[PDB]
Amino acid sequence: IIRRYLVKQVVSTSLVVIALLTLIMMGGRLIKYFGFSIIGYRMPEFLTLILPLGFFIGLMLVFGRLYVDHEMAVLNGSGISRIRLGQLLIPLALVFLVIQGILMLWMTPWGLRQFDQLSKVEALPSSKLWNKWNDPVIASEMGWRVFGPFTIVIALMMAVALCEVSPRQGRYYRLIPAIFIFASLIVLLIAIRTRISRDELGVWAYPAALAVYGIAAALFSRK
Amino acid sequence: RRIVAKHVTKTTALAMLGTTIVLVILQVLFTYWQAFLYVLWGAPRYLYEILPISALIGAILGLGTLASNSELIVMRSVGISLWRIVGWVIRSALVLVLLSFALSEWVVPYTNERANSVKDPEDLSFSQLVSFMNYMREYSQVPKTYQLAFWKKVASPFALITLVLVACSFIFGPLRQQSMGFRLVIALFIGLGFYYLQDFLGYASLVYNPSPAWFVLGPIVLMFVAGSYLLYRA
Amino acid sequence: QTLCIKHLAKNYSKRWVVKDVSFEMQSGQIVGLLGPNGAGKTTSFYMVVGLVRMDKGEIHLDNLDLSDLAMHERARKGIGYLPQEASIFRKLTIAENIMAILETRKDLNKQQRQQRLQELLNDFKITHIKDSLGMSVSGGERRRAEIARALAADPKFMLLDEPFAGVDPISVGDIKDIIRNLKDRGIGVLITDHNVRETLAICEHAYIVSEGAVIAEGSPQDILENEQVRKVYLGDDF
Amino acid sequence: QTLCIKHLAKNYSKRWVVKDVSFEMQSGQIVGLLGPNGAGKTTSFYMVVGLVRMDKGEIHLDNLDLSDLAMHERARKGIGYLPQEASIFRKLTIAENIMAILETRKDLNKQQRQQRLQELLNDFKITHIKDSLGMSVSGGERRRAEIARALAADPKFMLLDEPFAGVDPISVGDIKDIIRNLKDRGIGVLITDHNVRETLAICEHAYIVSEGAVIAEGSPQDILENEQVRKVYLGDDFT
């Protein structure tokens, strides 16, 4: 009952944030493009970034709401920690990992393939990129598609760590400080995709970037 | 009344200037030895484009501190109207408007020349823009991309004051009794919403027959009317 | 002066929290607006001040209709408000808080403004903290500066919101002495409070509002011996 | 069982809010942690619950240290918390509110979880409203659902924060029966409240925390006759 309570809350507020970020992230690009089929073919490209951001923000809004209106004091006071509440959402995070794995591996290339013809390694089919790991350009793109979906898991254990907020501080107090901590992971991963494409860093740095953020989030959640 | 006016003005002015210092530092870092001077010389041009959005966040945080501390309730409890408290905040914004004029007229056109040496109609200063348009009009037809640039500059002080009044009306209206984080989040959505709306309607003025004055002064008049209505609801 | 208030009404989420609340208050008299929590004592109190817009009702102050006036337009007519929460100007000194509202007065010049400020500080015994910031004073000392600040505007009716909120039994006498001082100054006091034991000890005429309507009226002695109030609000033992 | 608290301390902004607060509460006994507002009675209460991190001292429950355990680890030892503000799960059914905590219990199976929920609803006379949402109930009925939910975790000590907060005199007696019932259930109750007059009417052992330290201890009759309390907290005239 407590797992279904959280999953229903997180899914409801993540879809609101995702639809709010899609209207903002691609409303800005649509205006720049104006300066309807193009937006349709770039849905999987932007939702590749919005989905980890929507899940992270939606996780902190739910965990912020539990703290603000004292539903966390009665959950900790009943024997259910905050770490335990984050472990109840692993089945949900696995669904979002599978969902984004579909976007990153299939629809992001397919969406970029049709857009390119209408308007590159960003749009090549994943079948043609499974092999040819020797070439750093394919190595960066294929690694971006395999280790990319695992930002959902990192968005789960890092939103649990950075959600503790006082009732008087507010539900939105820890949003801007911690969205930048999450965004620093994605900005680092985009900054890693470029380094691998120039054969300067190696494909091994994708799990290393996640592990450093994974261990840092796990240590901070257990302080 | 002077002591109350100074307290409201100084608190908002420090919030508008405090947000300005932070927003410029972040934008300098985000934009970023030869490449450091090129970004450092561009600070006045980054400063000019932050003033409309730093005044919005400054009035949200400046009045939010007053509202959350129940200081705006006891100014009304003694007979100080909402439009008087807005007028005191506008005095703080009038420093940013005067700063916008100083940057536009004497600072931006100079550091832009210095920045380009280290390494558009929008980039032209108002003194250069009006003089150039008057020169073209005397011998040829002025393009619609210069009329839009002219209207986007003459309506820059009026977009700073209107966006401040909207911020003040939100504190007294929808954003009353809300958290400081929620006010900051909403202040960021209005800032992006205004930048996108003025960008889109700027492009739409170059593709449609009506003059760019309608598209540039459109949102400013509507936000002023809508913002002044939220103040009438108290 | 009489503050006639007739047929107040207000709805929230299509539910009428206040239904026909009407009471009369006179200058130089303490009137307690009491009742069960959430039954409309707070909402009816805020509609007198002006925070909550009046859906229906008439508020008169010596045949002068204040119904349509806003919060500030009523405050200029002589209605004061003392918030329950800390409402002192944090970055202004205690003497500057009182002087801030004294400059609002039109019938005072600079010469008598300083004289009025001096006696207001002496009346509430906050002279020793007149130079300390409002954010660095005791809760008991700060509350005396908020009442002194409200009196700088020369109100005719001071509407106190939760005066005995978080007040220890040792300092409940200090608040009663303050409220009694406001009455002796010719200012009517309207008190809404959850602490009904002490609010029924200073007020001369109390109004108990339950289910959104005034269910009883009269002196505190008559309020106690009221069957409907005893059954609904005060209980059999009190 | 005897909850032992020794030498609590906590400094906020380089100011020692709590200085050497120590009290003992036994199971089945109601203890009122009172004192002047802002004198450290609220902060000392929170260090017992676990909201604010301790800065000096120790907490024992039958030679079983709880100082290093977090808030959730003490709850499994038998320590409950009831926030003063509305802490019900707003969008959960009242029957599900008690059930959400009953599923936490390891010593109950499905067969006896529904039985425990059914008797918990009947013990608090909320079985008629057991099908309504948490946010769509009366203030008096909501608090009865928060105490039934707290008992679902089966605590040995309940730390009530401001139980008589925003409570009409008609419904003060209803809470008195609830707290008396908690004592009759073998569960010790620790109460911190600003309403000292009504808190002293049910507690058999009250602690007065002034200037950050415990200055009084014993039955409410001994507290009233104490000249140190009547000088700082209760005043000359108080009953």
Author numbering:
A (entry chain F): 2 to 36, 49 to 132, 247 to 350
B (entry chain G): 4 to 35, 49 to 135, 241 to 355
C (entry chain B): 10 to 247
D (entry chain A): 10 to 248
Paper text:
Assembly of the outer membrane requires transport of LPS across a protein bridge that spans from the cytoplasmic membrane to the cell surface. Here, using structural, biochemical and genetic approaches, we show that these antibiotics trap a substrate-bound conformation of the LPS transporter that stalls this machine.
LptC also contains a TM helix that exists in two states. In one, the TM helix is sandwiched between the TM helices of LptG (helix 1) and LptF (helices 5 and 6), which form the gate through which LPS enters the transporter lumen. In a second state, the LptC helix has moved away from the transporter. Movement of the LptC helix between these states is thought to be important in coordinating LPS transport with the catalytic cycle of ATP binding and hydrolysis. We obtained a structure of A. baylyi LptB2FGC in the presence of LPS, although density for the LPS molecule was poorly resolved. Despite several attempts, we were unable to obtain an LptB2FGC complex in which 1 was also bound. These data are compatible with a model in which binding of 1 and binding of the TM helix of LptC at the LptFG gate are mutually exclusive. Superimposing the LptB2FG–LPS–1 structure with the LptB2FGC–LPS structure identified shifts in the conformation of LptFG, particularly in helices 4, 5 and 6 of LptF.
